[PDB]
């Protein structure tokens, strides 16, 4: 702090891919971190931005979400945890699932 910066750089927002009315895949990556390396990744996903919690935790980079609802807005935020301290979160990526009006294939 007083002398010498610590912690990785901001984390970029993941990529959401509405797999289905009740399905959504996410994907993130590691920022330009040379000094300290990332230990794990805490991804949060909840109905609305106001409501969000830890959904998946691990060194993984790709995660698929299921059991969602159609025509419903959702948000996700990924943060990088280091050995010196947890870094900031990424730009909340908003996404809305497609309406399930009728049958479905799968």
Curated annotation (Swiss-Prot):
It is found in: Golgi apparatus membrane. Expressed in the odontoblast and nerves in the dental pulp. Also expressed in trachea and to a lesser extent in the brain, liver, lung and kidney. Residues 10-100 form the Fibronectin type-III domain. Mediates spermatid-Sertoli adhesion during spermatogenesis. Belongs to the FNDC3 family. This is Fibronectin type-III domain-containing protein 3A. It comes from Homo sapiens (Human). The gene is FNDC3A.
């Amino acid at each position: 702090g007083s002398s010498g910066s610590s912690g990785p750089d901001q984390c970029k927002p993941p990529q959401v891919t509405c797999r289905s009315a009740t399905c959504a895949q996410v994907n993130w990556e590691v920022p330009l971190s040379n000094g300290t390396d990332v230990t794990e990744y805490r991804l949060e996903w909840g109905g609305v931005e106001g409501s969000m919690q830890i959904c998946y935790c691990g060194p993984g980079l790709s995660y698929e979400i299921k059991g969602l609802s159609p025509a419903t807005t959702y948000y996700c935020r990924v943060q990088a945890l280091s050995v010196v301290g947890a870094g900031p979160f990424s730009e909340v990526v908003a996404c809305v699932t497609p309406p399930s009006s009728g049958p479905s294939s799968g």
